[PDB]
C-alpha cells in the first residue's frame, strides 16, 4: 500500500467502504450534499490508468464535481461531524482546498470541526462509512 | 524525507522549529503545560541511534513525561487551539492516544478542536512554532 | 523525496545528471545506443503534469523509443558495464522488462552484468553520469 | 508494507520464505556459508521491539554474525548466483557493505554477479527461497 491512512472522522453506523488499489494521483471528486454529505465518488490514477472509486452513499442532495487541473493538488481538507435527525454522528460538511482554489464548504457546518492541513504530501484517495449518507470519512496520503 | 507532514494547527507567531533528521520511531515526549501547552521535547530513533529534538518553548507550566514501551505507538492525537492572554491563537491542549493507554489532556481542552486518528501509519516526530509557549503544532507520519 | 534510489552502476567519469522533481509515473524512455549506451531521455508525471528529463549523453548510435501503455510498468531492469575505447568503465547495455513485453537489449550485452528485479514497487525515474556516452546509471523506485 | 521489494536473485527451487511484519531497522544478520550460502537469519526492529526472522535454510557450512552498531547501516549488497552440484542455480556468495566496513564475501564467488548499491534508502529485511541451501535471495528497502 505504502500510504498513510487517516481516519475515521464521524460515527460508527453505515457500512465500511474502501479502495482496492494503489492510487498515486487524485483526479476527480464527485460529492453529493445538502444538509449533510450524502455520497462520495472519486477517480484516481494507477500505473497511468484511471479507476473510479464509489459511488459510496445514497442518492440524496445535489451533486458537485471537482476536476483537478494538471499541477493542481489538495493542500488541506476541513469538515465537521455531528448529529442529523436520527443519525447520532455523521459527516455534516467538507471543504477541499487545493493549491489553486477552495471547493466548498459542501453540506452544512454543524458539529465538531476537524482539519487536515498538509505541509508535505499528496492526498490520493478516500475511504469511509456509508449508508444513505456519509457516516464517516478518511483520507489516503502519499509522501511527496 | 519520505514522511507525510501534517500541520500547522495554531497561530502564526513565535518561531518555526523543526527536525533535521530521518526519524523512524518516536520513543519519548516531554510536554510542559498548564492553561496551554508551554513546550515540547521528544526523542526519536534514526539508524539505531537516539536523538533528542527540542526543547521547543518556554519553562512555564508543569512537566509530564511519556515514555513509550516496546510495542507501544501512537494511534491518534487530539488538541485544541485558541487565544491565551495577549496571544491571538496558540495550542491550548494536546492528548496523545497510544494502542495501550491515553496520555493527557495536557493544557485545557477548550477552544477549537482538531484530531488526527491514524488508521494505518506511525507518528515518528513533530514540529511547530514556539516562543514562550507553543504557538503551533504539526506531526510527521510514516507509512506502516 | 520518498523514493528509494539505487546506483550507480558503471564508472566515475562524465558528469552527474539527476532529476529535480517528485516523479510518480514513468511514461516514456528514449535511448540512444550501438556498441554501448549513448544517451538517455525519459518522461515522468508529477501532479498530473508531464515533465521531460534529459537528454543526457551524446548523439551517437541509433534511437529507440519505449512508450508505456496505461497499465504497463517496469518489473525488472538488466544491464552490463565495462570498457569501451578509451573509457575505463561505462554502461554497455540495458534491457527494460515490463509486465507486458521486453524492450532491448540496447547496446551489447557483454561485460559485467547487473540486474534489478522488482518484486514490489514501481520504477519512476533514472539518473546517472554522462559525457558523450552513459558513464553510469541509476534508478528511482517508489513503494507500491 | 510500504517497502520496495527487490528480487529474486537465484533459482526456482526450495521453498519461498518471507517476513510477516513491518521492519524499520536491520540490527543483525546470522549467515551460514561454505561453498555456497547455506542459511540466513536476521533481526529487525518494529515499533521498538526486536523480532527474529528465520532461520531460513539448512544447517550446513559455518556461521558468521554481523551485529550493526548504532549509526551503522548497509549501503550495498553484492553476490553471485550459479550452479552447485545438482542445484541448477542458487546463491553462491554474498557481501554486505555498510557505511563503516565490509562483511564478506561469504561462500564462494562463482556464477553470474549481481550488485545493489544504495544511493538513498535503508535495507531493513530480506526474503528468499530456501531448502538445504539458499536457492534465492531478495531485499526489502525503506525510503530514507
Ligand atoms: O443532506 C441530507 C439530506 O438533505 C436534504 O433533506 C435532502 O436534499 C436529502 O436528499 C439529503 O439526503
Ligand atoms: O447513512 C446514514 C444511515 O444510512 C442508513 O439508514 C443506514 O445504513 C444507517 O446505518 C446509516 O446511519
Ligand atoms: O500554560 C500557560 C500558562 O498558564 C498559566 O498562566 C500559568 O499556570 C503558567 O504557568 C503557564 O505558563
Ligand atoms: O509563544 C507565545 C509568544 O512568545 C513570545 O512572546 C514571542 O515569540 C511571540 O511571538 C509568541 O506569540
Ligand atoms: O555506442 C557507442 C558507439 O559505438 C560505436 O563505436 C559506433 O556505432 C557509435 O555510433 C557509438 O557512439
Ligand atoms: O561519456 C564518455 C566520456 O565523455 C566525455 O569525453 C567526457 O565527459 C568523459 O569524462 C567521459 O568518460
Ligand atoms: O556451502 C555448501 C556446503 O559446503 C560444504 O560442502 C559443507 O560445509 C556443507 O555443510 C555446506 O552445505
Ligand atoms: O537448497 C537446495 C535444495 O535443498 C533441498 O534439497 C530441496 O528443497 C531443493 O528444492 C533445493 O534446491
d(CA A72, CA A54): 22
Beta-bridged to residue D120, according to DSSP, are C5
User: Radius of gyration of chain B from Cα atoms?
Assistant: 14
d(CA B53, CA B126): 9
Per the CB < 8 Å rule, is A3 touching D3?
Answer: no
| B111 dihedral zone (left: phi>0; alpha: psi -120 to 50; beta) | left
d(CA B84, CA B129): 15
| A4 dihedral zone (left: phi>0; alpha: psi -120 to 50; beta) | beta
Beta-bridged to residue C123, according to DSSP, are C141
3-state secondary structure of D72: coil
d(CA A9, CA B15): 31
Separation in Å, CA of B75 to nearest CA in chain A: 10
d(CA B44, CA B24): 7
Query: Which residues of C lie inside 8 Å of B (Cβ-Cβ)?
Result: 1-3, 143
At C11, give phi and psi (nearest 5°): -100, -170
A135 in ligand 2 pocket by Cβ < 6 Å?
Answer: yes
Residue C65: CB atoms within 10 A of its CB come to 10
Per the CB < 8 Å rule, is B45 touching D68?
Answer: no
Residue with CA closest to ligand 7 atom 10: D60
Q: Are A130 and A56 in contact (CB under 8 A)?
A: yes
Q: Which of C14, C33, C35 to mutate to test the pocket of ligand 5 (most atoms within 8 A of CB)?
A: C35
Residue with cell 510477516: D20
DSSP letter for each residue of B61-112: SEEEEEEPPTT--EEEEEEEEEEETTEEEEEEEEEEEESS-EEEEEE---SE
Q: Are B10 and B127 in contact (CB under 8 A)?
A: no
d(CA A72, CA A2): 22
Burial of D138 per CB tally in 10 Å (0-12, 13-18, 19+): buried
Resolution of this PDB entry, in A?
2.7
Residue with cell 552490463: C80
Ligand 4 geometric centre to CA of B129 (Å): 9
User: Which CATH number goes with the domain that contains A48?
Assistant: 2.100.10.30
Nearest residue to C137 (alpha-carbon basis) of C54, C24, C49, C27:
C54
Show residues of chain D in contact with A1, CB under 8 Å. Answer: 1-2
3-state secondary structure of A123: strand
- Beta strands across the sheet bearing D87-98: C15-17, C122-130, C134-142, C4-10, D112-120, D74-84, D87-98, D102-107
d(CA C72, CA C66): 11
Exposure on the CB side of residue C138, measured as CA atoms within 13 A? 22
CA B110-B116-B117 angle, to 5 degrees, is 120
Residue with cell 485545557: B108
Q: What technique solved it? A: X-ray
D131 in ligand 7 pocket by Cβ < 6 Å?
Answer: no
Show residues of chain B in contact with D28, CB under 8 Å. Answer: none
Separation in Å, CA of A22 to nearest CA in chain D: 11
B94-100 — which CB contacts under 8 Å span 24+ positions? B94/B31, B94/B33, B94/B37, B94/B137, B96/B29, B96/B66, B98/B68, B98/B72, B98/B73, B98/B74, B99/B71, B99/B72, B99/B73, B99/B75, B100/B69, B100/B72
d(CA D4, CA C119): 8
A11 to each of A92, B6, B143, D7, how far by Cα in Å?
A: 11, 23, 25, 43
Exposure on the CB side of residue D58, measured as CA atoms within 13 A? 13
Q: Are D39 and D32 in contact (CB under 8 A)?
A: yes
Q: With b meaning 16 or more CB within 10 Å and e meaning fewer, what string describes C36-47?
A: bbbbbbbbbbbb
C-alpha cell at B60: 512555564
**What range defines the domain where residue B87 resides?**
1-144
d(CA B124, CA B116): 14
d(CA B42, CA A32): 43
Separation in Å, CA of B16 to nearest CA in chain C: 22
d(CA B116, CA B118): 6
Chain A residue nearest residue C67, CA to CA = A48
Nearest residue to A122 (alpha-carbon basis) of C142, B31, D47, D55:
C142
Q: With b meaning 16 or more CB within 10 Å and e meaning fewer, what string describes B70-103?
A: eebbbbbbbbbbbebeebebbbbbbbbbbeeeeb
d(CA B120, CA C88): 49
B35 in ligand 3 pocket by Cβ < 6 Å?
Answer: yes
Number of domains in chain C: 1
Exposure on the CB side of residue D54, measured as CA atoms within 13 A? 26
Q: Are D48 and B71 in contact (CB under 8 A)?
A: yes
d(CA C18, CA C16): 7
D36 in ligand 7 pocket by Cβ < 6 Å?
Answer: yes
Q: Are B102 and B5 in contact (CB under 8 A)?
A: no
A55 to each of A38, B72, B138, C63, how far by Cα in Å?
A: 10, 37, 33, 46
DSSP letter for each residue of B115-139: EEEEEE-EEEEEEEEESSSEEEEEE
> In what helix (H) or strand (E) does residue C54 lie, and over which residues does it extend?
strand C49-57
What residues have CB less than 8 Å from A5, skipping those under 6 apart?
Answer: A127, A138, A139, A140, A141, B118, B119, B120, B121
Amino acid at each position: 500500500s505504502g500510504l498513510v491512512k487517516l481516519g475515521l472522522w464521524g460515527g460508527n453506523e453505515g457500512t465500511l467502504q474502501d479502495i482496492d488499489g494503489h492510487p498515486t494521483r487524485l483526479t476527480k471528486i464527485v460529492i453529493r450534499s445538502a444538509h449533510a454529505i450524502d455520497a462520495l465518488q472519486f477517480d484516481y490514477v494507477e500505473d497511468g490508468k484511471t479507476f473510479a472509486a464509489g459511488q459510496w452513499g445514497g442518492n440524496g442532495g445535489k451533486s458537485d464535481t471537482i476536476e483537478f487541473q494538471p499541477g493542481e493538488y489538495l493542500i488541506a481538507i476541513k469538515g465537521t461531524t455531528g448529529a442529523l435527525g436520527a443519525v447520532t454522528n455523521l459527516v455534516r460538511s467538507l471543504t477541499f482546498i487545493s493549491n489553486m482554489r477552495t471547493y466548498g464548504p459542501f453540506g452544512l457546518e454543524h458539529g465538531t470541526p476537524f482539519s487536515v492541513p498538509v505541509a508535505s504530501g499528496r492526498i490520493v484517495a478516500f475511504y469511509g462509512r456509508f449508508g444513505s449518507l456519509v457516516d464517516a470519512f478518511g483520507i489516503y496520503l502519499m509522501p511527496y
